[PDB]
Each structure stands twice: as structure tokens, then as C-alpha cells.
Amino acid sequence: SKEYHIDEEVGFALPNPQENLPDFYNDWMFIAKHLPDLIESGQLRERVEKLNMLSIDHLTDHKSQRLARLVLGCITMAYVWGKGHGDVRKVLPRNIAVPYCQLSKKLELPPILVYADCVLANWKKKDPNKPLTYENMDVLFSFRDGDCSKGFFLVSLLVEIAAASAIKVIPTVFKAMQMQERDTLLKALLEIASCLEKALQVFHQIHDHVNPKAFFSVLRIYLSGWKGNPQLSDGLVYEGFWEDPKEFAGGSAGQSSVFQCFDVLLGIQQTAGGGHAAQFLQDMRRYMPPAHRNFLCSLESNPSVREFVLSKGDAGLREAYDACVKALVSLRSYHLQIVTKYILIPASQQGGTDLMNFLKTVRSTTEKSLLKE
């Protein structure tokens, strides 16, 4: 590939993000490094106003700028939702709203916490000379004590690094098609399916590191946005930056590029149709880094691997392509059982069928693309 900011070892996630802003921004990071104690003791929402407007011009590196996107990303999320019980804040102060919105429009991201922030730029190696395992990694910023966000964010990242190992052979696939090298194409497609089968194994780790009570009842509120959300009926007001309140969608893993990249590579029409699911995934691309957004657009400009394999009438090539489509149906059927345990069941203990049909539609169209036609 060219420079869509892809790391051969890590992929779309940010490789080794820096852990601390420059000492100018010390007073920012203070609220960011201490949100658990800060909102439990009720000291959070006013310490925001105690801040004065820092300028973004001394964040020199991309790693520096994106780390600041994370600290301001969570600082706003903790401000708007607060305790997490219903006390809502419908307007951000301006000494925090316009630093965020400026660096957001410089990085071309919406001024909200996106998946690229709280996962891809939100980790560190405990001991730098170890493998990237959950035992050796740690999240840089959490919202509340017992959030399980360490397990939730990193297990999310861990299977992203797992499937990103398949990105490296995507050029091999398109090479083998155009130069009509049948065998290497079949071994490239099998290696694609290997990673997605292993990303399902890494997905198993979420049971050990997140419990359903915490996720649904503390972590889910802090990651929800103010688009189509009654608590901020028509969005959040940005003092000094925008006249009116603007609506933005909360974090989703639909903003990850690998979890849309395999759907376009395999000719799976996730974004086709005027459907709710297609519109959701198409819109979530706006919440991806501009380099990653340009990477999906770049994949869509290639010939369909699905049409190539079906034309050749090769039982070998078709079985390998189905393996990838199967490995995706697996990752989404298993996700369905996890949404069952971590959202469905904790909701019946305090309408939501729309949540399950979306994920079933995205799997339904994935299952249709199998070479059973």
C-alpha cells in the first residue's frame, strides 16, 4: 500500500502513541489523567471552567495532536454526561469548545470522542520489550473506577491488530488477479481468512476483561453521542465556535476502517442500498481519520474480487473466498451473542429490537455474498 498511515505491525491503530502532552498543556492532561476521582467527588464540571483557553499551536506532531484529541475527547464526554445518572450539560464552555473544534477541523474529525481516539490512540506497552498482549498493555485514560474500559478498549484494539495482519496481503490479491496468477490468489485469500479466524479467537478475551454490569451501566453512557438523542434533543452547543448546537454520533466501532475494509474488499455491499445499516456505516466513515477514510475509497476503486472468483469457475478459488465470508459471519454472529449478554440482558433489569436487526442485517448481507449465490 501507499501512505494511508498503515503500520505493518499494528495497522490502522496509532503505533506507540505518546503518553504526555507538553508542559504547556499540563493543566489539560490533569483533568484527563484524573476523571475517575474528578466526577465521583463532583469536582469535574466546574474545573472545566477553571481552565483558561489554551492554544493548539504548540502541539507539533501528529502523535501529539491526536493525544490531545483524546484528552479533550474524554474531558467533554465526562462533562456532558457528568455522573452518568441524568444530569445533562447541553453546552460546552468556550475555553474548551474552540480548542477542540480547531484541532478537530485540522485533523478533519468531528469534535466528539471517536473510535480512533479512545482505542487507536489510547494504549501503551507496560514493558516496551514484550509482545502486544493484554497482560503487557494498559489504557491511558478511563472515565470511572471499575469502568472495565481497559478490557473493553484494548480487546477491541487487540482484534483490530489481529485482522490488520490481513491488510498487508491485500495488494497481493489485486496483483494476482490482474496478472492472472491463480495459485497465489488462492493462498492470499486463505491467509485473509486465517487472520479473521484468529481475530475471532482474540475476541473471546472480552469475557474475561469486561463484565456486563459495568459496561452497560457506566461505560455505555460516556461513549454515547448527541445525535438523535433526547437528552441533548438537537445537539450540543459549542460556545464561541458555532452559533447553534450541532449533532454528532457517539462512538462506535463502525468508525474503524478494518471493520469496513473487509466488506468492500470482498464485494460485500454493506454501504449499498438506502437502508438504515448502509446509511449508518457510510456515515460512520466521516468519523474515521482522513487517511483511513481515503483508504476505503481507494479499495472501492479496484475490481471486485467477488466477480473475478465467480467468473473463473474454480472450486479452489471459490472455497477460499467463502472462507473469508464465513470468517466474517462468524465474527458478527459471535458479536451478536456478546450484544445479547452486554446490552440485551442488562436492559431487562431496570424498542431494543432495532438494535438486533441492524446487526442481523449487516450479517444477513454478509451471508448473502457467499458463493452459494
Place this chain on the structure above:
Amino acid sequence: SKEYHIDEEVGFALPNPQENLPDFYNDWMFIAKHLPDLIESGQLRERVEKLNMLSIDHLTDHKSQRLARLVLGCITMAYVWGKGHGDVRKVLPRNIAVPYCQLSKKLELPPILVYADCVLANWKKKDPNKPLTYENMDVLFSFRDGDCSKGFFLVSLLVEIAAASAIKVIPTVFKAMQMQERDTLLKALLEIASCLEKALQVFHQIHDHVNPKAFFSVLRIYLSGWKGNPQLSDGLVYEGFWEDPKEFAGGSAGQSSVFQCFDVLLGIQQTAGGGHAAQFLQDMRRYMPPAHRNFLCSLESNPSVREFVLSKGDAGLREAYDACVKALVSLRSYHLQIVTKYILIPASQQTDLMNFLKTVRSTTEKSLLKE
């Protein structure tokens, strides 16, 4: 400029489209070649219904499939809207709804008549040796006798080809910004500014071939879709392909790819934000051919030309960039004049859209180098 299916003469349009399908589709072609006659005689719907279901497996090349799309697209709009007097059909019969939908998914386009059907693939040179001018061209299919569909389509197409001549220099803009070649970058922008300038002069031909009442009362209804239409509140049933009635937008020049690419090129954030205008132009992109959608998002992959120009302190450079933007404000201001003549005052003869054209006009005029 790799194969985004942009010819250097006709641009986004289809270079020399096909007008005859194979003999296996005569029953389709007959209905399409006689849409006015079949509608005036009340015979159209009976002919569409008695159709046998035909396989799309004989449409081999891209052009044959584009003709059948425009063939089946027009027959569909004819069947749904009828004589145009409110007696609609909200169930498209199986024997036409299935081949239409199979073909549409094969070409990755909504199963409704789209701009790249009735315009970019709906033309024909009278004489193969003479240039592309209105008097040398003709449409392939029309709705009613006197609907001025020849004028409306061919003028829109000729305006597109005019602006399409600017597509060829877009590679030199981004390579000049790259190598920092100032003078060639200035000549490139002014060449864009001239092609946009000429397209406005081609636009003037609209008054000579489109009668205002025939458009508003006749042609505007055979181009309307079933998305937010009270006459088909929940869409149209594609009997035999989907259980449910689907909603789809009618033809609109928002589906034209020339007239969204220049806003992207010049850093005009027409699709930015979440407003209704930005989403309508974003929602209208799913109606472009797949190779044309790819061209737009790949332009977005490039650095912003506007911020580059704003950094140079080069008055000659800015005057050239502004020349492009002002030519877009001219085209949109003259459009607003046109919509008043061809829609507004015919409606008075027994604002939601006007605020849309003024919103996008203001967004363009905001990109003028004043900040």
C-alpha cells in the same frame, strides 16, 4: 487520470452510447421507442404487464447494460406515473421489476431512472462526423409528445461536456501544488475557470428548447421519484425482488458528477456538516455510476487547493482561484433564475427547494478568498 470512466471529450457522459439492444429484447425496446404513443392511447400499462420476464444474461458489455437501464428506467417511470394525472401504480410487475433490479445491482445503481441514464447515456449524433452541438444531437427516448425532453436532456448534457473539458487539467493542479510550480498552477486554475465560464454560456440554450409549462406540467412528473412523495407514501413495490416497498429519489442533477467535483476540487465543503443540503448532495451520490463515485472521493484524498493558495500571498494566484469560485456562483445564480421561470411561476398558475439552491450558492460564495 486512470480509468474513472471519464472520457477526455465527453467527460462523465457515456462515449457514443448504444441505441439498439439485441433482438432478444424487442418487447422492451418497442415499449421504450413508443412511450408517448402508448401513454396517449392508454395502452402502456397493458403492454408492460403482458411482458414476459426476460433474462439480463444477454447484456454482455457495459453499454448494452446502460441502454437497458435507460430503457427499463423510462418504461418504469411511464408505468408508475401513467398519463400523469394522479392515477399511479405502486406495484411494478414482476416481469419488469426483476430484470430492472438484477441489472441495477449489477451496475450498482438504484432501480429508478437516474441522471446517468436519461442524460449521460441518452444521446445520439445525427452525423458521426460533425461536432457535439445541439443541432447535431438527439435523445434516444422521451415521455410525452411535446414534453421538451430533447431540450432538457441535451442542454444538460452539453453543459456537462463543457465543464467536462476542465476535468482533464485536474491532474496538473495537484502535481503543480506538489512540485510547487506556481505559473503552471495559475494557468491550470484559469483553464478551469474558462471551462466553467463557457458552460454558463451553453446553459443559455435552455430558453430555446424547453417551454416552461411543458416542463412543469409534463416532464417534471416523469422524473419524480418515490421518496418522500405523498402519492407513493411508502415507496414502490419491486414485485418479485423485495418483499417491501422501497423508497428512491427521482432524477436530479445532484446525481451529475461534474457539478459536485468542482466543489470538492476547490475545497467547497458542500457535503460537510449534517444539514439537509449537505446530505441531499451526499445522498445523491449513491445515484452516480460506481466509477463516478470513486472519482469524487479520490479527489477528497488530495490536499486542499484553497489552503495552498491562501498561504502564498500571490495575488495572481488568488485571482485565478476566485475566478473558478465566481464562475460557480454565476452558474448557480443563473440556475436560480431558471428555476423561477421553469418551476416557480408555473406553480403560481395553478421555497423548500429554493432555500436549498440558495444554501449551496451561499456555501460556494463563502469559499471566495475573503474568509
